[PDB]
């Protein structure tokens, strides 16, 4: 607990205690209808997306805003029963592919994306699965914490930061992202600042 807490990005406690960004801000930093799989429909102007039922496909979405500096955190809400075989949460550059023709951990399967498999607890970056390391059951809601001053991506569950999952991100422009496989899944994004 001391180890994880001592690793926290600067300013995270005050970001999380601040009056949360309003709906307009959540929509401006939400899912981009112009930057998602053809099998995904962005709803509520960015607050959530719904993946249509399509067999043998993995489908992702990016947020509207890419981050290159500062601290950025957003809550992902993803119902436990709508995760299926591969539910991956993280970030991507604008170059990562958002669709593939099979069920896979698409986010993090290349050098343009970084993801946490919230079902298996594994981290993916340039990984097809074998050798992916374990990282700290994920409930419906989780916090995604992108520190672009240090260049790390980490997560929090139930108010506890679990440490950096990925490092060496400085010099890139990174967007919130997920890859999903479940028909009719509804994945919410709630930008919290900065």
């Amino acid at each position: 607990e001391n180890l994880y807490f001592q690793s926290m990005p600067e300013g995270l406690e005050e970001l999380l205690s601040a009056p949360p960004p309003d709906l307009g801000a959540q929509r401006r930093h939400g899912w981009n209808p112009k930057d998602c799989s053809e099998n995904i429909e962005v709803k509520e102007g960015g607050l959530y997306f719904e993946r249509r039922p399509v067999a043998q496909s993995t489908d992702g979405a990016r947020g509207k805003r890419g981050y290159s500096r500062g601290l950025h955190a957003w809550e992902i809400s993803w119902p436990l029963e709508q995760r299926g075989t591969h539910a991956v949460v993280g970030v991507a550059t604008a170059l990562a592919p958002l669709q593939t023709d099979h069920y896979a951990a698409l986010l993090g399967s290349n050098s343009e994306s970084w993801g946490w498999d919230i079902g298996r607890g594994k981290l993916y970056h340039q990984s097809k699965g074998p050798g992916a390391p374990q990282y700290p059951e994920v409930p419906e809601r989780l916090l995604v914490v992108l520190d672009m001053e240090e260049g790390t991506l980490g997560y929090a569950i139930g108010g506890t930061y679990l440490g950096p999952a990925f490092r060496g991100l400085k010099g890139r422009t990174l967007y919130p992202a997920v890859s999903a496989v479940w028909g009719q899944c509804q994945v919410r994004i709630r930008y919290l600042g900065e």
């Binding site: 039922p53 399509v54 067999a55 043998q56 496909s57 709508q82 299926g84 075989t85 069920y103 496989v181 479940w182 028909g183 009719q184 899944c185």
Partner: peptide
């Protein structure tokens, strides 16, 4: 599978 996967509700598809």
């Amino acid at each position: 599978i996967n509700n598809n």
